[PDB]
């Protein structure tokens, strides 16, 4: 059940893929639309994604539905996942994705500089967000 429309959808067959497929698609499209080297596309991808997910999970507090009055009035989406059963398989995947993204987006631009510093920062903050100990703590 998970009895929460806003967080229970991350359990039906397929979610894991979709995700990868979207990122793959992103890469493709970005490099195609304007000439770029693969490393540039992957960094463009990484930062895009940084922005995208960091905002949502880690700053959207609440739920859109009026079913429950406010019972999750302040809890980022990431705090509601798996009903706070810290460090489950879904959480491990959501944590794992930034690591692979960082590794490849840095490698394919074989640590030059501007890009490298940016992504260092990126992965850092995203991984910081998670972390079992860090829970309901500003």
């Amino acid at each position: 059940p998970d009895m929460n429309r806003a967080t229970e959808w991350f359990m039906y067959p397929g979610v894991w893929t979709t995700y990868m497929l979207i990122l793959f698609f992103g890469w493709l499209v970005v490099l195609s639309v304007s000439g770029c080297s693969p490393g540039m596309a992957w960094t463009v991808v990484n930062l895009a994604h940084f922005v995208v997910t960091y905002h949502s999970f880690h700053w959207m507090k609440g739920t859109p539905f009026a079913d429950d009055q406010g019972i999750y009035n302040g809890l980022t989406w990431w705090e509601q996942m798996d009903n706070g059963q810290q460090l489950t398989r879904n959480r491990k995947f959501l944590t794992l994705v930034p690591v692979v993204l960082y590794l490849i987006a840095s490698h394919t631009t074989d640590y030059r500089h501007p890009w490298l510093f940016l992504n260092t920062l990126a992965v850092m903050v995203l991984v910081v967000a998670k972390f079992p100990n860090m829970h309901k703590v500003r």
């Binding site: 059963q85 810290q86 460090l87 491990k92 944590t95 794992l96 690591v99 074989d110 829970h135």
Partner: peptide, 27 residues
């Protein structure tokens, strides 16, 4: 130095995977 970061992160994935689920505590 590519090797140090890659190795550290490899053992990082190992650490994160090998752990186990657990509930938060009560009061």
């Amino acid at each position: 130095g590519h090797f140090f970061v890659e190795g550290l992160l490899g053992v990082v994935i190992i650490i994160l995977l090998t752990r186990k689920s657990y509930k938060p505590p009560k009061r």
